[PDB]
Amino acid sequence: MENFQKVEKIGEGTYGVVYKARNKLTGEVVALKKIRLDTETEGVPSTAIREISLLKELNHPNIVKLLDVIHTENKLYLVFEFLHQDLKKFMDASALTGIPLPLIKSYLFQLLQGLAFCHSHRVLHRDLKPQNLLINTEGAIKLADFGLARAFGVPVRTYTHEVVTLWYRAPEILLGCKYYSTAVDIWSLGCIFAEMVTRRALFPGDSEIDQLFRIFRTLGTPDEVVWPGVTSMPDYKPSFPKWARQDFSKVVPPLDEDGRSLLSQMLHYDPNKRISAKAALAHPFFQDVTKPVPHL
């Protein structure tokens, strides 16, 4: 700690705050996350235990980098590479501008790039969302906040249910299934993808059942044909209003035929049919992607 100099608090999550900092010796600018211990409790938080290790094996250009870990006797500081801002703040500055289609396309591609990596390394992120993704002034985006992640196995066991931030949670979680897997991260990317396109949260529910109603009203109440099994799910009520799927041009006006197709494939109801990051990375939608620099 002697060598770091705290500048301004960047954020503040669970176990502590978060500072932008600089190293007095080498000039490197970093991000320091002070996870509390208190001790006399449970020692190291099982959430910090996952973040560190699962991140020990996730070296990728599209995944925030864990520089070091200073596990003193009183706290625990995770030292991170420092990026400019998250996709939420950036999306706000584009409140009128609207993010240009190409830039967006670059964004999603990268995310998917990083996302398939994780998946290829048996890790579910389980908390994809704009404030949890960081861009740099160079046109790069990166996944971050592995606080809520877990290493998965094959095939999977039942995991923790209380998972994913509400607006970006998949329907298989909302309906309480016994098992969920990679597809949950895609559902999230899909929502984020749609969000870049209209700068307003696709399905901003204020509750489990409203989230569900919002999805239904846009994708049409799932039945046994589309998603074999839904009417046997724990939280599924046969009294659900039955809405009819809406035209994607009315949901995602700006998207062209391709972007439409991918999106829809990213939000398939049946997790077993939802497009995967690997398959995504290959959709015709991305045949002409480039790397535009963001406006800042």
Partner: peptide, 7 residues
């Protein structure tokens, strides 16, 4: 704006 589920 909902936070992240906690453990």
């Amino acid at each position: 704006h909902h936070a992240s589920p906690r453990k």
